[PDB]
Amino acid sequence: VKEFLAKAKEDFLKKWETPSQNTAQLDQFDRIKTLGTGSFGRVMLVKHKESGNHYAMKILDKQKVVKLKQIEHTLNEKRILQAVNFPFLVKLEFSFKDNSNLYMVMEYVAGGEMFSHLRRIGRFSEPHARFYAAQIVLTFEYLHSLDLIYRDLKPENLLIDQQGYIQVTDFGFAKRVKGRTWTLCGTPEYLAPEIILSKGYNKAVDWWALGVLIYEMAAGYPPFFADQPIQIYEKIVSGKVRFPSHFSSDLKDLLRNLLQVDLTKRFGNLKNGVNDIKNHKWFATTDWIAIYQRKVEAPFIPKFKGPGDTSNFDDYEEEEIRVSINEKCGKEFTEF
Amino acid sequence: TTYADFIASGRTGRRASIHD
Ligand SMILES: Nc1ncnc2c1ncn2[C@@H]1O[C@H](COP(=O)(O)OP(=O)(O)O)[C@@H](O)[C@H]1O
Ligand SMILES: [Sr+2]
Ligand SMILES: [Sr+2]
Numbered sequence: 001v002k003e004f005l006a007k008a009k010e011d012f013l014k015k016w017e018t019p020s021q022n023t024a025q026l027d028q029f030d031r032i033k034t035l036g037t038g039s040f041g042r043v044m045l046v047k048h049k050e051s052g053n054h055y056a057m058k059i060l061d062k063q064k065v066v067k068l069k070q071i072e073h074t075l076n077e078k079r080i081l082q083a084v085n086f087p088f089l090v091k092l093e094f095s096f097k098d099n100s101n102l103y104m105v106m107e108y109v110a111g112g113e114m115f116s117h118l119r120r121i122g123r124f125s126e127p128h129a130r131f132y133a134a135q136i137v138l139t140f141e142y143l144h145s146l147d148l149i150y151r152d153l154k155p156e157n158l159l160i161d162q163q164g165y166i167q168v169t170d171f172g173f174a175k176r177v178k179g180r181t182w183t184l185c186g187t188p189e190y191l192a193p194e195i196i197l198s199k200g201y202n203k204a205v206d207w208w209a210l211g212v213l214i215y216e217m218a219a220g221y222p223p224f225f226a227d228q229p230i231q232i233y234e235k236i237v238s239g240k241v242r243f244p245s246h247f248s249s250d251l252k253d254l255l256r257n258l259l260q261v262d263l264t265k266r267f268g269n270l271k272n273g274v275n276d277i278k279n280h281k282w283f284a285t286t287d288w289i290a291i292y293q294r295k296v297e298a299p300f301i302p303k304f305k306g307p308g309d310t311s312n313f314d315d316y317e318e319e320e321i322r323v324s325i326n327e328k329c330g331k332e333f334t335e336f
Numbered sequence: 337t338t339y340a341d342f343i344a345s346g347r348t349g350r351r352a353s354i355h356d
Contacts, residue, residue, distance in 0.1 A: 039353065068355055115350060156350050172353065184356040189347070221342035228346075229354070244338070 001288075005145045008085070012146050015083035016176070021336070024094035024105060026323075029057065032308065034316040036113075040064045040074075041101065042319070045108065045310055054307050055093060056109070059321065060102040062329040070172075071332050073185075077171045078104060078336055086142050087294060088135045090159070090169045097336050099327045109167045111160030111302035112312030118155050123220030126251055128299045130282065132158075133214050134291050135166045137283075140210065141274045144203050147178050153209040154187050155216065160312075164298020177202075188229040189222045193261050196233045207268030207277070211258030218251065219244050223259065237261075250282040 032045040032054075041059040048055060065074050081092045081104065094105040114132070118124070124132070136153065143150055151173040159167045173185045180200040192208035194201040215223045224235040239261035243252050257276075260266040267276045278288060290296045302312050342348065 039355070070355060113350075119348070152353060154351065185354065187351050187353050189351060219338075221339060225342055225345060225347055242338075 005142065008142065009146060011085060012083050016079065019079050019082055019335070020095070022096050024096050026096070026098060026103065029055070029105075031321070033310055034318055035310065035313050037316050039068065040070070042316070045308065046105070047308065054108045055105045056107070058104040058106070062100060062102060062333060066329055066332060073172055074102065075333075075335060076175050078102070080148060080174045080176065081171045084146070086139060087292065088139045088166050088168055090167045095336070097333060098323050099325070100323045101321070102333065102336055106169070109159035109161050109169070110304055110307070110309060110312060111162060111164070113156055114158040114160060114166065115155035116312070116314070117160065117300070118217065118220070124217045126218055126248060129214060129217040130286065131296065131299055132166055132217060133210070134283065134286050134288065136210055136213065137274065137277055138288065138292055139168055140206050144206070147176050148174055149177060149181070149203050150174050150206050151186050153206065153213055154190050155213070160300070160302055162302070162304055163294060164301045165294055188232045189225060191233070191236060193237050193239065194263060196237060204263055204266055204269040207258055207266060211255055215255055215259070218247065254280050254282040
C-alpha cells in the first residue's frame, strides 16, 4: 500500500511548492444560504453561474484573522488544502481574495455534520462507528505520510456525503512539520495531554484524538467532559477513563492503547506505526481496500432532496458580505 | 448516569476551537 503513497506524495509536493492562486472571483457565484458560522466568518452554499454546480464557500475576514494572530495558520490551511487529494478529504475547487476577505470554495457535502446525526440518534453502534473510524485511520495514514498533522478531529469537522462516507473538513490547524511543534490549539475535549502540558508534540496527537472520537461515536458523549475547559484539561491529564457497560472488550482494548497518556506506548506511535491500529482485533472484520475504494455500503445514508438542498444543516442568521473600497492586509496575505 | 450528566452539561452543542 506504500507504493501508492509514493505517487501521492509526488503530486502533493508539486502543489505544496507551487500553490495555485486566484482561480475564481466572487461574481462567478450566487450566494444562497449560510451552512455554518465560525471564528473568522462563515461558510455558505453558493451556486456557480456558468456550470450550475453548488459549492460550499468558506469566507475569512482578513482583519479578524490578524486580530486573533492566525495569519500563519490561515496560510497553512489554504496551502495544504489545495495540495492534498484523498477520497475522505474535502476537495478545494477554487480560492481567491478581495479587499476584505479570503475565499475557499469546496465541494458541497450535503449530508450535514457527523455531529448533528450523532446528537440526534444518540450514539452509533460499534459496527457503525468502526466504519467511520476506518476512514479516519486511512486518512491520517495519508496525511502523516506527507508530514502533516491535522490537529482538529471532532464530529463538527466531519461531514457525511451522499454515499454516507466521511469528508474531513477545516484544515485551520493543519501544519507540515518534521519534528515537534508547540502551538496550543484544537478543541478542548479532543486535546492530547502533551499539548496541554506544553511539552512539544507530534503526529501522535492525531491518534489520541482518534481515540476520543471513537469513544464519542460509540458512547454518545466524550470520555472527558465538564462545563468549563479548565476542568476538562484536568481530567485529560489524569488520564482516567471509564467505559460504558455496553462497550465490547475489543473496543475497550483499542481505546486503552489510543488513549494512552504515555507517548511511549500509544498506538500509532510505535515501531509498527499505523499497522498496530489496522491489525487490532476491533478491526478484524475490516476490509481496508474495500473502504478505500468506497465499495462498502454505508450503514447510514442522509436524506437528500435534490442539490442545493440544505435540510441536513441547522439554520443560521444571514449577514451580507461587505467588501471595503480599500485593500486590507495586502502584504500579510500575498501568497494566498 | 453519565449520559444524564453530560446532557445536563453546558457542552452538548457545537464546540469551538481554541486558538491561544
Ligand atoms: N465542504 C462543505 N460542505 C458543506 N458544509 C461545509 C463544508 N465545509 C464546511 N461546512 C460547514 O461549515 C462549518 C464550518 O466550516 P469550518 O471549516 O469548520 O469553519 P471554521 O474553521 O470557522 O470552524 C462546518 O462545520 C460545516 O457545517
Ligand atoms: Sr471547525
Ligand atoms: Sr478552524
